[PDB]
Design a protein around this nucleic acid. Structure first.
Lengths: 150, 383, 794, 149, 305
RNA sequence: UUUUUU
């Protein structure tokens, strides 16, 4: 190792960098804050209503060809539906201890009875988008009054 | 496994679902295990769980319910419990319809008033099967100490045909009258082991009723040495290989050494105040007959089947909840039932050991025989 | 393959699909499956902020979808999935999107084409329209509306236009309204219409509020709609009601990110105390941009406040939650996402500087400089200039730092000081002195004046003129309160001149009234150096032992004691070995020097052990070599240990071992020395000693030729130095005098003169006396030994 | 805010009072901080029992608060520092199976609370329960069962 | 919620001094499971984990000083070792006898790494280069050059075409074997690295520097995906699991942690060693870990699949 | 004075 004297001479008189004058502190910098809550808006996309399912020979079923049909159990989810048709789940997940997920039907209970027979394709109900707009959230006492747009 | 589907075998006891796992993995293929802490292979087709885990993954989906065929409820007579009887009924209610159910039980009287409820809670027919005539029947003796040095006289008070013999009790009461704390009990145990070692009905499981007594009488016994040389070598090699994985300080502390000393002679203790690594070694050295006397307790009486040669009791009343209750017929039947072994003896002997006062045959009647229990329902509300 | 895809596990499904494709190539369902698998991988890639991988995946997915579309172009799902792929690349920071679309998609099937962002979105819209043409369903209508919305958003966000995107927005509203009327019982359509209705270009908040309320009523389990209403209330100064909506929304779904971010924003607005923790939780969930910026801001602001570092706010949060590294990674992701915002870059630079990642801090400041070229406010541009220049100077390339400091108005203390330091580092000492005095002109906070005076002393000393530096430091001492840096610099200057007069006074001044200094090692070093100047050479070790007794901790102190015992008074070798071992035990990062010193001490000792393995000199020096293979002292120690082991084995007379490694170690020593900045005299001593030791080792093993070639090359390299020539003499005269022979007086006189060339070295003289004994002139040998004895005693 | 402001090596010992199922008592050789955290938890339990009994439930406050039986708090506190098992076994008169039991029942609860602190939004409770859990399972208390392997 | 982790075997005193490197090779097509360790000796003991235990098979030695790196091959039966001895003698693993000997000092080789096809055996030098030798075919075909400092770590991506090199002072260099051109140099940490590893499929590069952090970079760009900080001292080795979900890190604080890259958290910690842990590896289908430590011991763990 | 599970 080097002797003490030259070690001290290098340690202190090599350059002024070591001084507290040139440190990372001793600047007192400041920043300005800019929030942007409009970025929080989230829009989710619709699912694909088609599957291109196979065909089957009526006896000893064989694949004639693949034809597209309409799916029927979309808009069904794992946290809002209790049936064995819902999408499997979020991912590989903790086996138990999961709030916000629905159990399947308890076996003595079925609870599916409805027809809702419209079955239209041009089913446009002529909803009014500007006459009387409801402005009370479900559970609150008052909403907000916005000026009308002409 | 033939249908490619999945099956869940559910056991209530945390210690019962380990050897069942071992035997099901040894018998065929893949068997996952789930408990509070173990999660070996949670993708197999014979998942073994505790009912509170099936109750917890029925409230969520858990996507295992999508592939089940059978749910094998093993011991469905725990519904009568006071703090866990609601779990079996929350499970039996939340089960979906495509899952068939198997309910093993223990020959309760009102089996047709319970299966009817489960039959009409679902919309399926339920078949009730009940059997009798267990193999290797059991003879209930009574041992009262006398000539504790070598002589042991046993009075037969119940036989393989259920007939109560008051004559034997008459003899016992007469002898007790004619007759007229730990030092007498030591001679009692040496007289029992003297009359038991003369025959080949050796692998005896003592049932003590308090953990301090449980290891205390095994300490006070202090000379049996029931093991040959090759059994010495196999006991020592197996136990050291299993205990020598873990570190140094963990292998020299009072219970480990003291219990190892007891097992060296061919003696074991199995109460609840020992490390689980010692309970597990006691059972695995008892399941191959290389340990010769076991001072077990009721936990061995519940969590397993494991027939042994000679079961010997020690008292009539155990304190459970501020009661100092005597064994109820339902309880006694299980411990007595695992007395005979299968094809290694004609029958099995259950020895009662009244020492303090008169046996009081009137209550012995209801203890040694009696309708086990009806099937109640302990449903209650939790948060 | 499809079943495996259903459950995630995308890689296995892709592999299976490819195996299928290898056999048959026109199999449409496999092609479609490959496309969805890549699309899902791309979306998962975009959930974490990996924007390059997502682009790769989407390009490949378009490849597969066109491959499928060549065969059956009547099916709708293929067109819709193509449109999904095309439009899922919004907010991916253009100049990162160049997509190699090829073929039928662009009408006619010509070659290949590279599309930018707007073109890609337009192609997506075209694809959705074509899919809708042949199968008119609601979902495609809603997706088409969203695509038009994205195109308008992209045009506005690049400031490319305004009021020329009106038709696009009306088209978007038309499509969403058509979808909603087609099936007015779906929360998705109401929610999408509501979100679009509140876009900055349309600004119809009543319709948006209506749409969100209808969506909530349609299906009550809806965190998205509740959070969108919360945002609507929050931007229009309704803090309470927005708080109600966000709290209930997270009540419905505890792991939705935006509700937590909104809660953090509300807490910040109303000034609570757990806003920083809320931002930390937001960071822990997933990488959103707003939460990222909030957390970075709070971390940097907390670092600024210098009254914190006892609070258990700073202590726990920053130093036990590892806030700084987390903030750095967060900002890296943010900046790659956005990359047109300067304060983000400046915070990134500040944090990187605190992690001593100086090169990345320089890059961050550089990018901030580029951004701020044109702006209304020039002060922030000047501040960025000072910081970028300062970091540039910190790690070489001084010319660039000087140029950066030129291109700024040099009127504030910080900028002038940085300029001064850069100038000094390059050279130009007069310029640095001028800058420091000019900075002294405008000075408050007398601490700063004292520091500038000390810097002046250092810089003018460098030229020479120690007298004026000394007077200037005394002038600094005359100030109200000394700084413990002027006194310390004064002691070092006093030691630099071989006079202990002022050094003692300065040391007494430093010790008397300074306790707030927290090194406790530097003072010991100064005291010991002062004692060593006077040549005392025994007090030194005693003084360091006193210091270690005062503070029995501090591994550094023990290590220094071991080093001094190795250098001065090497007769307490055993104590030195113990001290080095103790220093090594009490930590790990002082391993390097402590192991070196204890190995050298064991070398000095000899073989005073029980012939025990695993604790000889060789083992410890080997351990040190493994810890830090960078310094040349460890390699020299290895040379010495090998030679000593050879001699010990020779004493036991079993076998010489570890024969030929000297050349490799010498090469290592030279290579390691090359990278040391300056200890010039020490480096020269080390290289000279290593060369001599290597030559002697080569002589000992018996590889005379290699030693000869080494010496010849060394002398051919540089002019003669009278030391190595002695080595050449020794290697020459080994064959001769090993067998009895008579020597001519010419060689003997030459050897004597050569020894006289390099005098003041007892080894040489003792070797010459051995030569005299070899031929046999004993009395002459006696005289040579006597001369060596006199030299040693003096 | 009872637990949030303590060291992670004290929250494990404070939570050891819900699981032990052993005869309970207070302590003497306990720090001041533990001796007040015990009172704070008991006071919170008193409030919960008071809202139960003042609502219509039939469970007196004494019956609810009697399930909390501390008395292994100090033993768990000493275990969660690096103390080997032997000294704990010596420490007090409780059978050495019922101690491994309680520790096994606590290291699995300070880990579902590690999972719940991420749900409430307390990443400092998450960062302290993810420390008090990983420092509690090291040795023969958590030895693997023979049957499984 | 974790799996069942635990020890299976504990060799009491493998060598006479510290063990500095370890390599696990399932070289033969059947289940061979040979473990090769080098120590602060000449000893290069070659163990075999046959059914439940390590039985010493070879004790070959030709070295003079302590071994700093050992390596094993998956295709051939072969091994290589380097030491402070300035020699790269590479063994045969079948009769326990030396095959070759390469002269190279600390300016020509520090640490070993075989090729993906076990053919080239690149090493990291002192002056900054990476020297690629040829096994069974001579010496020093070519050397990649990075204008940097002493280079400590050498890693090969499992599929080939990538070579990574850490250095003292932190900087990391990524080359592509196809053309030999520096793709990009990351700056990583600020102090020496001394361990690196790719992931299977070679899209994730895991460093481990001397300050305690574990950067997780991303290949084909310069993105980093997070910093894993859970140790209390130096980090000395990192081994990546055969399935791309976990990796194991051994630190100088006497602790072997197992992380997972999905959530960047530590699943299980092993507290079984008593001194610095210098080497960790996985095996074949990764379900066991070997950990050699400064104290003479060999741990084999159980990480169920 | 016994026993038990998330």
């Amino acid at each position: 190792a080097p002797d003490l004297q030259q070690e001290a001479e290098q340690l202190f008189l090599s350059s002024p960098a070591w001084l507290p004058l040139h440190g990372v502190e001793h600047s007192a910098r400041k920043w300005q804050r800019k929030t942007d809550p409009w970025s929080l808006l989230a829009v989710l996309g619709a699912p694909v209503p088609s599957d291109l399912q196979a065909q089957r020979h009526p006896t000893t079923g064989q694949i004639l060809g693949y034809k597209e049909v309409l799916l029927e159990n979309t808009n069904l989810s794992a946290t809002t539906s209790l049936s064995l048709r819902r999408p499997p789940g979020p991912a590989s997940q903790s086996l138990w201890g999961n709030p916000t997920q629905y159990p399947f039907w308890p076996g003595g209970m079925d609870e599916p009875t409805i027809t809702d027979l419209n079955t239209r394709e041009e089913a446009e109900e002529e909803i009014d988008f500007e006459k009387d707009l409801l402005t009370i959230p479900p559970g609150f006492k008052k909403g907000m009054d916005f000026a009308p747009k002409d | 496994q033939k249908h490619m589907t999945r099956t869940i075998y559910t056991s209530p006891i945390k210690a019962l679902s380990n050897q069942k796992f071992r035997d099901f993995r040894n018998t065929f293929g893949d068997v996952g295990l789930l408990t509070g802490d173990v999660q070996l292979h949670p993708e197999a087709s014979c998942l073994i769980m505790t009912t509170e885990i099936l109750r917890s993954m029925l409230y969520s989906g858990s996507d295992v319910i999508r592939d089940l065929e059978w749910v094998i409820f093993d011991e469905v007579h725990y519904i009568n419990d006071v703090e866990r009887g609601v779990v079996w009924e929350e499970v039996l209610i939340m089960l979906p319809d495509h899952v068939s159910i198997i309910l093993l039980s223990a020959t309760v009287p009102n089996a047709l008033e319970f299966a009817d409820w489960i039959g009409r809670l679902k919309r399926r027919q339920i078949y009730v099967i009940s059997t009798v005539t267990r193999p290797v029947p059991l003879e209930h003796y009574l041992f009262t100490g006398n000539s504790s040095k070598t002589q042991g006289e046993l009075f037969l008070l119940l036989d393989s045909r259920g007939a109560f013999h008051t004559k034997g009790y008459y003899a016992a009461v007469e002898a007790k009258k004619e007759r007229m704390g730990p030092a007498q009990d030591r001679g009692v145990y040496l007289s029992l082991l003297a009359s038991l070692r003369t025959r080949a009905q050796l692998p005896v499981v003592v049932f003590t009723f308090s953990r301090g007594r449980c290891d205390e009488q095994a300490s006070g016994l202090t000379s049996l040495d029931l093991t040959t040389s090759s059994e010495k070598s196999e006991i020592h090699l197996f136990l050291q290989r299993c205990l020598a994985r873990l570190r140094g300080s963990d292998r020299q502390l009072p219970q480990v050494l003291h219990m190892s000393e007891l097992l060296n002679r061919g003696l074991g203790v199995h109460h609840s105040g020992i490390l689980p690594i010692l309970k597990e070694i006691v059972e695995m050295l008892f399941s191959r007959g290389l340990v010769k006397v076991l001072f077990a307790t009721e936990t061995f009486a519940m969590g397993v089947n494991m027939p042994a040669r000679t079961v010997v009791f020690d008292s009539m009343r155990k304190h459970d909840g501020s009661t100092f209750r005597d064994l109820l017929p339902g309880e006694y039947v299980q411990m007595a039932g695992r007395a005979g072994r299968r094809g290694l003896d004609p029958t099995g002997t259950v020895i009662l050991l009244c020492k303090g006062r008169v046996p009081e045959m009137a209550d012995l009647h209801r203890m040694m025989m009696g309708k086990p229990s009806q099937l109640q329902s302990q449903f209650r509300l939790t948060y | 393959a499809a079943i495996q895809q259903i459950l995630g596990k995308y890689k296995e499904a892709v592999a299976q699909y490819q195996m299928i494709i290898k056999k048959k190539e026109d199999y449409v369902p496999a092609l479609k499956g490959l496309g969805e698998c890549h699309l899902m991988m791309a979306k998962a890639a975009l959930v974490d902020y990996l924007d390059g991988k997502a682009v790769d995946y989407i390009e490949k997915a378009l490849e597969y979808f066109t491959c499928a579309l060549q065969h059956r172009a009547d099916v709708s799902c293929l067109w819709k999935l193509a449109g999904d792929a095309c439009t899922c690349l919004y907010a991916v920071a253009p100049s990162k999107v160049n997509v190699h679309v090829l073929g039928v998609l662009l009408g006619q099937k010509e070659g290949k084409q590279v599309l930018k962002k707007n073109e890609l979105l337009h192609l997506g819209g075209r694809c959705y329209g074509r899919a809708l043409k042949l199968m008119s369903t609601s979902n495609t209508w809603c997706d088409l509306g969203i695509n038009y919305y994205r195109q308008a958003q992209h045009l506005a966000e690049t400031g490319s236009n305004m009021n020329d995107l009106k038709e696009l927005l009306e088209k978007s509203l038309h499509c969403l309204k058509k979808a909603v009327r087609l099936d007015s019982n779906n929360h998705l359509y109401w929610n999408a219409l509501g979100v679009v209705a509140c876009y900055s270009g349309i600004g119809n908040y009543a319709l948006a509020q209506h749409c969100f309320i209808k969506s909530i009523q349609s299906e009550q389990i809806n965190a998205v709609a509740w959070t969108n209403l919360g945002v609507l209330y929050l931007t229009n100064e309704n803090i309470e009601q927005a708080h109600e909506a966000f709290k209930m929304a997270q009540s419905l779904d505890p792991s939705y990110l935006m509700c937590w971010i909104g809660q953090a924003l509300i807490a910040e607005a109303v000034g609570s105390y757990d806003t920083m923790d809320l931002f930390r939780h937001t960071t822990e969930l997933n990488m959103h941009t707003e939460g990222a910026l909030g957390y970075a801001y709070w971390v940097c602001t907390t670092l600024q406040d210098k009254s914190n570092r006892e609070t258990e706010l700073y202590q726990y949060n920053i130093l036990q939650m590892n806030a700084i590294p987390a903030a750095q990674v967060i900002l890296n992701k943010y900046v790659e996402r956005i990359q047109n915002y300067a304060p983000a870059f400046t915070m990134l630079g500040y944090l990187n500087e605190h992690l001593q990642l100086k090169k990345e801090a320089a890059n961050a400041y550089q990018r901030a400089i580029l951004l701020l070229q044109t702006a209304e406010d020039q002060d922030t541009y000047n501040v960025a200039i000072r910081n970028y220049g300062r970091l540039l100077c910190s790690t070489g390339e001084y010319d660039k730092a000087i140029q950066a400091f030129k291109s700024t108005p040099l009127e504030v203390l910080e900028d002038i000081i940085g300029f001064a330091l850069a100038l000094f580092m390059k050279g130009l000492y007069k310029e640095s002195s001028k800058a420091y005095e000019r900075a002294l002109s405008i000075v408050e906070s007398e601490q700063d004046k004292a520091h500038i005076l000390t810097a002046l002393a250092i810089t003018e000393y460098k030229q020479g003129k120690t007298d004026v530096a000394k007077t200037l430091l005394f002038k600094c001492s005359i100030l109200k309160e000394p700084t413990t840096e002027s006194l310390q610099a004064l002691c070092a200057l006093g030691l630099a001149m071989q006079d202990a007069t002022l050094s003692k006074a300065a040391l007494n001044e430093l010790l008397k009234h300074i306790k707030h200094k927290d090194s406790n090692y530097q003072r010991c070093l100064l005291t010991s150096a002062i004692y060593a100047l006077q040549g005392r050479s025994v007090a030194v070790q005693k003084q360091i032992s006193k210091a270690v007794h005062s503070n029995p901790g501090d591994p550094a102190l023990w290590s220094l004691l071991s080093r001094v015992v190795a250098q001065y008074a090497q007769r307490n070798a055993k104590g030195g070995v113990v001290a080095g071992n103790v220093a090594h035990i009490l930590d790990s990062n002082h391993g390097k020097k402590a192991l070196l010193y204890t190995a050298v001490n064991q070398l000095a000792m000899g073989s005073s052990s029980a012939e025990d393995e695993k604790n000889t000199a060789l083992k410890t020096i080997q351990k040190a070599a493994l810890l830090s293979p960078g310094d040349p002292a460890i390699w020299a120690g290895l040379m010495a240990a090998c030679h000593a082991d050879d001699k010990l084995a020779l004493v036991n007379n079993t076998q010489p071992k570890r024969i030929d490694l000297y050349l490799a170690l010498l090469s290592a020593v030279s290579a390691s020395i090359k990278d040391e900045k300056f200890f010039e005299n020490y480096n020269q001593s080390l290289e000279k000693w290593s060369l001599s030791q290597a030559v002697t080792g080569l002589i000992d093993t018996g590889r005379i030729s290699e030693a000869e070639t080494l010496c010849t090359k060394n002398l051919k390299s540089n002019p003669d130095q009278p030391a190595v020539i002695l080595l050449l003499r020794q290697v020459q005269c080994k064959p001769l005098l090993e067998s009895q022979k008579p020597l001519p007086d010419a060689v003997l006189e030459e050897l004597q003169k050569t020894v006289m060339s390099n005098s003041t070295s007892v080894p040489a003289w003792q070797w010459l006396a051995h030569v005299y004994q070899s031929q046999g002139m004993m009395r002459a040998a006696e005289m040579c030994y006597r001369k060596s004895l006199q030299l040693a005693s003096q | 805010n009872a637990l949030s402001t303590l060291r992670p090596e004290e929250i494990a010992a404070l939570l050891s009072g819900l699981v032990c199922q052993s005869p309970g008592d207070a302590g003497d050789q306990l720090p001041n901080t533990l001796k007040q955290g015990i009172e704070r938890v008991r006071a919170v339990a008193k409030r919960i029992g008071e809202v139960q009994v003042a609502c219509g439930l039939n469970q007196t406050v004494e019956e609810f608060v009697g399930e909390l039986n501390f008395g292994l708090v100090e033993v768990v506190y000493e275990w969660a520092r690096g103390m080997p098992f032997s000294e704990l076994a010596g420490l007090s008169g409780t059978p050495e199976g019922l101690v491994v039991r309680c520790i096994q029942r606590l290291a699995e609860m300070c880990r579902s609370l590690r999972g719940a602190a991420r749900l409430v939004g307390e990443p400092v409770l998450g960062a302290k329960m993810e420390t008090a859990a990983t420092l509690l399972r090291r040795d023969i208390v958590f030895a693997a069962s023979l049957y499984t392997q | 919620m974790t799996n069942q982790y635990g020890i299976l075997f504990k060799q009491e005193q493998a060598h006479d001094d510290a063990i500095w490197s370890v390599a696990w090779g399932t070289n033969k097509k059947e289940n061979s499971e040979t473990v090769v360790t080098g120590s602060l000796d000449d000893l290069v003991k070659v163990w075999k984990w046959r059914d439940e235990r390590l039985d010493l098979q070879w004790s070959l030695e030709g070295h003079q000083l302590g071994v700093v790196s050992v390596d094993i091959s998956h295709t051939l039966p072969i091994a290589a070792s380097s030491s402070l001895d300035a020699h790269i003698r590479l063994w045969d693993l079948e009769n326990g006898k030396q095959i070759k000997s390469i002269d190279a000092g600390p300016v020509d080789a520090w640490t070993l790494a075989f090729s993906p096809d076990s053919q080239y055996l690149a090493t990291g030098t002192h002056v900054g280069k990476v020297n690629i030798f040829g096994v069974e075919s001579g010496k020093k075909e070519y050397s990649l050059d990075t204008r940097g400092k002493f280079i400590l770590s050498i890693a090969y991506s499992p599929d080939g075409k990538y070579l990574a090199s850490g250095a003292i002072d932190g900087i990391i260099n990524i080359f592509d074997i196809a053309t030999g051109k520096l793709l990009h140099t990351l700056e990583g940490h600020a102090m020496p690295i001394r361990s690196l590893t790719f992931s299977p499929d070679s899209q994730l590069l895991v460093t481990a520097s001397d300050d305690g952090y574990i950067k997780i970079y991303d290949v084909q760009h310069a993105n980093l995906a997070g910093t894993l900080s859970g140790h209390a001292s130096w980090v000395l080795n990192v081994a990546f699991c055969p399935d791309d979900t976990h990796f194991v890190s051994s630190s100088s604080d006497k602790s072997v942690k197992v992380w997972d890259v999905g959530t960047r958290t530590c699943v299980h910690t092993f507290f079984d060693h008593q001194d610095q842990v210098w080497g960790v590896k996985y095996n074949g289908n990764g379900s066991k870990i070997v950990s050699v430590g400064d104290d003479q011991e060999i741990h084999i763990y159980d990480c169920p699949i």
